[PDB]
Write a protein that binds this DNA or RNA. Structure first.
Ligand SMILES: [Mg+2]
Ligand SMILES: [Mg+2]
Ligand SMILES: [Mg+2]
Ligand SMILES: [Mg+2]
Ligand SMILES: [Mg+2]
Ligand SMILES: [Mg+2]
Ligand SMILES: [Mg+2]
Ligand SMILES: [Mg+2]
Ligand SMILES: [Mg+2]
Ligand SMILES: [Mg+2]
Ligand SMILES: [Mg+2]
Ligand SMILES: [Mg+2]
Ligand SMILES: [Mg+2]
Ligand SMILES: [Mg+2]
Ligand SMILES: [Mg+2]
Ligand SMILES: [Mg+2]
Ligand SMILES: [Mg+2]
Ligand SMILES: [Mg+2]
Ligand SMILES: [Mg+2]
Ligand SMILES: [Mg+2]
Ligand SMILES: [Mg+2]
Ligand SMILES: [Mg+2]
Ligand SMILES: [Mg+2]
Ligand SMILES: [Mg+2]
Ligand SMILES: [Mg+2]
Ligand SMILES: [Mg+2]
Ligand SMILES: [Mg+2]
Ligand SMILES: [Mg+2]
Ligand SMILES: [Mg+2]
Ligand SMILES: [Mg+2]
Ligand SMILES: [Mg+2]
Ligand SMILES: [Mg+2]
Ligand SMILES: [Mg+2]
Ligand SMILES: [Mg+2]
Ligand SMILES: [Mg+2]
Ligand SMILES: [Mg+2]
Ligand SMILES: [Mg+2]
Ligand SMILES: [Mg+2]
Ligand SMILES: [Mg+2]
Ligand SMILES: [Mg+2]
Ligand SMILES: [Mg+2]
Ligand SMILES: [Mg+2]
Ligand SMILES: [Mg+2]
Ligand SMILES: [Mg+2]
Ligand SMILES: [Mg+2]
Ligand SMILES: [Mg+2]
Ligand SMILES: [Mg+2]
Ligand SMILES: [Mg+2]
Ligand SMILES: [Mg+2]
Ligand SMILES: [Mg+2]
Ligand SMILES: [Mg+2]
Ligand SMILES: [Mg+2]
Ligand SMILES: [Mg+2]
Ligand SMILES: [Mg+2]
Ligand SMILES: [Mg+2]
Ligand SMILES: [Mg+2]
Ligand SMILES: [Mg+2]
Lengths: 53, 157, 148, 185, 233, 51, 124
RNA sequence: GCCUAGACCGAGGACUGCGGUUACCUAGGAUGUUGGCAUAAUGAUCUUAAGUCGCCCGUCUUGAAACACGGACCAAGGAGUCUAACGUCUAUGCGAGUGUUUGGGUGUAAAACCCGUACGCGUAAUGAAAGUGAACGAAGGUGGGGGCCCAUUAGGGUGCA
RNA sequence: AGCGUGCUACUUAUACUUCACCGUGAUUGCUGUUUUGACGCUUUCACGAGUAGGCAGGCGUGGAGGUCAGUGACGAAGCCUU
């Protein structure tokens, strides 16, 4: 990670731009759209009790 | 108490008060308080008396007359919080109340000739307008009291 | 003064700062140096090692006057020169005429060699000198004269 | 109620005034309380704190320490500041011309500074020729050279000095100080 | 001395009047800046709301499902007293600056802070605060940590003097930085003294110390944190 | 010496937020949204009613 | 308030703090003593027990030491003792010592009236 | 956005600040007015009644109101002291020295004042002892280090403890 | 007015919010206006349980040096007393 930060910093320095090297914890996910072509929702219900012995 | 002498740094000068920003604003009266409204007095000598409201003085008080002939309540001031404002109204547009103010009721038994003359002059117009409504003079001449089973939170006035 | 002691502040509190369970008994643990090998070993071993046992040989009738030999180092040797004439001696001293410092007459038995001398000849009279003390005196052009 | 993350009602643990009731030391505190409060110079804030210190926290500064501090490169004409007593050193071979401001001077110290062309001034005289401590150099004496420190942190294999009244072969040298007598610590 | 002190007071009054004239003239521009900033914040709030609404409607129309972006901010209120807390949740509550009952703090949701709040979960009620809730909190009970002292946020100069290096010049800049979790959320939320709320007007549920899901008060209530804060602030 | 609530004191509200005046002037608290009368759920979203 | 103006005087506790069981036993005087016992109901602050002195009852620093008339009271034993109250006649009142004779007490009252000093015990 | 009912509070005490309306303000803490009282309305205490709560203190104890122990009552007396030698800390005097008080001088006579040789401790340690006995160097190098010097964010120099 | 369960309102701890006052700790500033208190004045914030025990600041007693040219037979000390 030290090498990667050094490589990324010089590359941003080479391109004259900035790069952020601090690690981040996992963030909450963004918005998204769920396609339903081939994936129409299937309805589930709780199942009755059975004995299998 | 003890033997502790005052020190030189214990000053006796009284500081001035800070500049107050409590600029007074005019009194708001209840919507039911309209000149000519019949009022019920709740405290004082004339408690229970039904009287006519005439003018809002600059002292935040109400100018009131009985009329004196019907009630025995003369021209005087009352406080708005010691008054029940009923819904009965008398046309007082024909009553001249220009000369009445705070300085009229200034403290100096007997009674001024001016005050007696004003009583008669006001009561003439007041009686003239009162006669139009039947039983209004009788209503004004009768005292108010709470009967058994009277709930002031349920009664309309 | 008694008015400053904590005995005056403990008045009114039952146990006088001694505890309600432990109390202030006569001599718990013994008197004096009792139990130094059994229940006070942890104290003597930690803070006073070497306490128990014999080391070395005895010396019947030891007279400490025999071993009297106060030490003076070289950095303090010129303090025995007269204060009113020290600066003159520091200037006019040569091989032909150097100040005499009688160390025994000032109460010293041995001259030791800590520190540095002025590069100035001196005549030092001593009962004893160290090897390095005499080497430093000769280097500044001085000499050591043994006395008794 | 509060879940306290630190101890409540805790004094700073630093002296804010001298323990001494000497009125003349108070005058010096009077002067440097004003200077530290108003000059933004870090020198004046250090001096005010040093005036509070106890006797063992202001060890004497020998005239040899001042000589060695003046022998730093570019420090030969600096003003030596000692918040405490300046003592003499009869082991010096020579002393330079210097200006030294101290709480106290010994007779030998005052003689030696003035003999070599220097000045021995007080700390109030310092505040007029150097109200911000310009071109100064604070010298502190050895704190760990005290005799009481010899016995601090004593223990097995600690190498400190035992608290003992007499010294000799019969005094705390046998068991625990020698492998021939059991163990050695 | 009467005329001496009157002359000095009138002279210093004139100097103060001139300096205040100049100061107000200079500050007018700064107030225009913060006015523009607040207007822009309102505009972007409205634009984002309408954009999300439109995206939901379009996904509904186009046989799809718009999944909302996960919340980036949470408001955590300690609703439990200070007695009988195990060392690890006690340390977690101390590090969240929740050292009394009814203390509130803003937390930016990631993984480290989420696992922190999970450790303190049986002792706190938390949720996702709305913009009006943040505004009301900061306006009524907003305090700053100035030289380790709790100072009321009664003037924008205090906020500027403490957060201008983070581009916070107004109380609305601070509210925006909290709400839309900004690059300086850490400094702005740590500058904010923990909110010291009252008890709810209307009470809690019959038994607080059980999860919001099971009919209690602890855990994540999400949009009902706004009603709870309305009760308690 | 005495904290005043900007949600109660209008002068303090204008002192802290100068944009509140425009908010009041523009009736931002009751601003209408202009849009068409549409219903985009007529199709597959009726999977909510039954399945 | 005929003295230098002061805030309204507040006394947090107006009764006497009486030592526990100074009512049960004659040997126990009413002078306050703090209970130090391990089981003491008063030291443990049980509900229904007597109030105890603590720093919370301390007087307002602006009304502390002021008598009901608004003055701080200074003890006077002779006529020369009134000299320290010359510039404090509106904030300090004089109280004549009990052991001053009936002759010298008349002189103190006479000079105090001349100087404007108020006397808290003017009759005895 | 608007209207409306009630309760508690009024700390501060010339001015200083931020805003608003554009001089004034509701904007860094209550003012205005009226009535009554000053032989008193008001406040405090004591006694007592009522309501509510309140078990006997001290002690040893994990646990005492305990069916654990002392205590019928009262007054007076009544228990961490002084000394020899010491540790830490602090104040003071002098300082590589320090300590006049064993003694001598002196005296207004157990005081105060004055005097000095020795001696104690310190200034050298280590070894069982015979014995030996502290500068390679600017009294050492390295990394920090308050303060000081040169600068000009930064940077450099010097750097006591 | 029991049991299981849901709901609306309501009751009140020395707990929470705001405020007054006390103390502790910190803190802002205070000498050409420091000005007969700088061991002092002042701004601000937070906090306050406690046996054994520690420390600090105070109350009281016998006697001593100094001082009040202090009280007192025209009434000291002591004692009784809403
Ligand atoms: Mg970068
Ligand atoms: Mg009739
Ligand atoms: Mg105590
Ligand atoms: Mg104690
Ligand atoms: Mg105790
Ligand atoms: Mg006892
Ligand atoms: Mg005790
Ligand atoms: Mg003890
Ligand atoms: Mg006992
Ligand atoms: Mg014990
Ligand atoms: Mg054994
Ligand atoms: Mg001998
Ligand atoms: Mg030897
Ligand atoms: Mg040593
Ligand atoms: Mg936080
Ligand atoms: Mg309610
Ligand atoms: Mg409820
Ligand atoms: Mg609820
Ligand atoms: Mg409940
Ligand atoms: Mg319940
Ligand atoms: Mg509320
Ligand atoms: Mg009292
Ligand atoms: Mg009392
Ligand atoms: Mg009361
Ligand atoms: Mg009794
Ligand atoms: Mg117990
Ligand atoms: Mg008597
Ligand atoms: Mg006031
Ligand atoms: Mg004009
Ligand atoms: Mg205002
Ligand atoms: Mg009971
Ligand atoms: Mg027992
Ligand atoms: Mg036992
Ligand atoms: Mg038992
Ligand atoms: Mg018991
Ligand atoms: Mg039993
Ligand atoms: Mg027993
Ligand atoms: Mg028995
Ligand atoms: Mg027994
Ligand atoms: Mg018994
Ligand atoms: Mg018995
Ligand atoms: Mg003598
Ligand atoms: Mg004699
Ligand atoms: Mg000697
Ligand atoms: Mg029941
Ligand atoms: Mg139920
Ligand atoms: Mg039920
Ligand atoms: Mg409910
Ligand atoms: Mg109060
Ligand atoms: Mg201070
Ligand atoms: Mg003072
Ligand atoms: Mg508390
Ligand atoms: Mg306490
Ligand atoms: Mg005494
Ligand atoms: Mg005695
Ligand atoms: Mg005496
Ligand atoms: Mg009696």
């Amino acid at each position: 990670r030290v090498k990667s930060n050094a490589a990324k910093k010089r590359e941003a320095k080479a391109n004259g731009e900035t790069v952020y090297l601090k690690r981040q914890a996992a963030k909450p996910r963004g918005s998204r759209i769920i396609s339903t072509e081939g994936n129409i929702p299937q309805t589930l219900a709780p199942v009755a009790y059975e004995t299998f012995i | 108490m003890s033997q502790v002498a005052p020190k030189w740094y214990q000053s006796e000068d009284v500081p001035a008060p800070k500049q107050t920003r409590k600029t007074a604003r005019p009194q708001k009266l209840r919507a039911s308080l309209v000149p000519g409204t019949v009022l019920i007095l709740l405290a004082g000598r004339f408690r229970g008396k039904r009287v006519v409201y005439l003018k809002n003085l600059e002292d935040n008080t109400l100018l009131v007359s009985g009329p004196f002939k019907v009630n025995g309540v003369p021209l005087r001031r009352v406080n708005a919080r010691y008054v029940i404002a009923t819904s009965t109204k008398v046309n007082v547009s024909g009553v001249d109340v220009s000369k009445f103010n705070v300085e009229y009721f200034a403290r100096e038994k007997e009674i001024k000739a001016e005050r007696v003359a004003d009583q008669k002059s006001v009561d003439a117009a007041l009686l003239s307008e009162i006669k139009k409504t039947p039983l209004l003079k009788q209503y004004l001449a009768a005292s108010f009291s709470l009967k058994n089973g009277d709930r002031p939170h349920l009664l309309k006035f | 003064p008694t008015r400053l002691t904590k005995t005056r502040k403990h008045r009114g509190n039952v146990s006088a700062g001694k505890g309600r369970i432990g109390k202030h008994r006569k001599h718990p643990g013994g008197r004096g140096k009792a139990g130094g090998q059994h229940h006070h070993r942890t104290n003597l071993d930690k803070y006073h090692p070497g306490y128990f046992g014999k080391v070395g040989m005895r010396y019947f009738h030891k007279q400490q006057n025999h071993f009297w030999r106060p030490e003076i180092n070289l950095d303090k040797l010129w303090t025995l020169v007269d204060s009113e004439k020290k600066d003159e001696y520091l200037s006019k001293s040569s091989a032909s005429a150097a100040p005499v410092i009688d160390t025994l007459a000032h109460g010293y038995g041995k001259v030791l060699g800590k520190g540095r001398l002025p590069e100035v000849p001196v005549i030092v009279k001593a009962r004893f000198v160290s090897k390095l003390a005499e080497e430093k005196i000769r280097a500044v052009g001085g000499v050591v004269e043994l006395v008794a | 109620g509060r879940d306290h993350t630190s101890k409540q009602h805790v004094r700073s643990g630093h002296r804010t005034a001298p323990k001494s009731d000497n009125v003349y030391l108070q005058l010096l505190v009077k002067l440097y309380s004003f200077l530290a409060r108003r000059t933004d110079a870090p020198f004046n804030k250090v001096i005010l704190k040093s005036l509070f210190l106890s006797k063992i926290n202001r060890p004497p500064v020998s005239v040899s320490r001042i000589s060695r501090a003046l022998k730093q490169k570019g420090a030969a004409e600096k003003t030596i500041v000692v918040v405490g007593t300046v003592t003499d050193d009869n082991r010096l071979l020579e002393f330079p011309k210097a200006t030294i401001a101290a709480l106290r001077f010994t007779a030998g110290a005052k003689d030696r500074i003035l003999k070599n062309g220097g000045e021995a001034i007080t700390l109030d005289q310092l505040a007029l020729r150097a109200p911000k401590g310009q071109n100064t150099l604070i010298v502190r004496g050895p704190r760990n050279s005290r005799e009481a420190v010899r016995h601090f942190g004593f223990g097995p294999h600690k190498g400190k000095a035992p608290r003992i009244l007499s010294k000799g072969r019969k005094f705390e040298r046998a068991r625990g100080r020698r492998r021939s007598r059991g163990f050695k610590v | 001395t009467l005329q001496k002190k009157e002359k000095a007071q009138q002279k210093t009054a004139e100097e103060r009047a001139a300096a205040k004239k100049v100061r107000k003239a200079a500050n007018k521009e700064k107030r225009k800046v913060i006015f523009d900033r607040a207007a822009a914040y309102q505009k972007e709030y409205t634009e984002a709301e309408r954009s999300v609404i439109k995206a939901k409607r379009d996904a509904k129309a186009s046989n799809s499902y718009y999944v909302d972006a996960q919340p980036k901010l949470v408001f955590v209120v300690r609703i439990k007293g200070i007695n009988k807390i195990p060392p690890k949740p006690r340390k977690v509550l101390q590090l969240l600056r929740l050292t009394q009952i009814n203390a509130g703090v803003f937390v930016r949701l990631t993984k480290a802070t989420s696992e922190l709040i999970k450790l303190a979960e049986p002792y706190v009620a938390y949720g996702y605060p709305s913009l009006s809730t943040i505004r009301q909190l900061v306006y009524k009970r907003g305090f700053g940590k100035v030289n380790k002292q709790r100072i009321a946020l009664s003037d924008n100069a205090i906020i500027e003097a403490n957060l201008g290096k983070f581009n916070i010049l107004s109380i609305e800049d601070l509210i925006h930085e909290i709400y839309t979790v900004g690059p300086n959320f850490k400094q702005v939320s740590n500058f904010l003294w923990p909110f010291k709320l009252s008890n709810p007007n209307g009470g809690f549920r019959a038994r607080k110390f059980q999860h919001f899901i099971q009919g209690g008060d602890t855990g994540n209530r999400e949009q009902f944190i706004n009603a709870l804060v309305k009760q308690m602030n | 010496v005495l904290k005043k609530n900007p949600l109660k004191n209008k002068q303090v509200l204008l002192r802290l937020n100068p944009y509140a005046k425009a908010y009041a002037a523009e009736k931002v608290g009751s601003a209408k949204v202009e849009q068409a009368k549409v219903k985009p759920s007529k199709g597959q979203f009726a999977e909510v009613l039954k399945n | 308030a005929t003295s230098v103006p002061h805030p309204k005087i507040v006394k947090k506790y107006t009764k006497k703090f009486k030592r526990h069981h100074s009512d049960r036993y004659h040997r126990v005087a009413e002078n306050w003593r703090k209970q130090k016992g391990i089981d003491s109901c008063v030291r443990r602050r049980f509900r229904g027990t007597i109030p105890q002195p603590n720093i919370g009852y301390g007087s307002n620093k602006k009304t502390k030491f002021l008598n009901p008339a608004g003055y701080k009271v200074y003890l006077v034993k002779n006529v020369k003792d009134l000299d320290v109250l010359l510039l404090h006649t509106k904030s300090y009142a004089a109280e004549i010592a009990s052991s001053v004779s009936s002759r010298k007490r008349v002189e103190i009252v006479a000079k105090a009236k001349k100087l404007g000093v108020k006397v808290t015990n003017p009759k005895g």
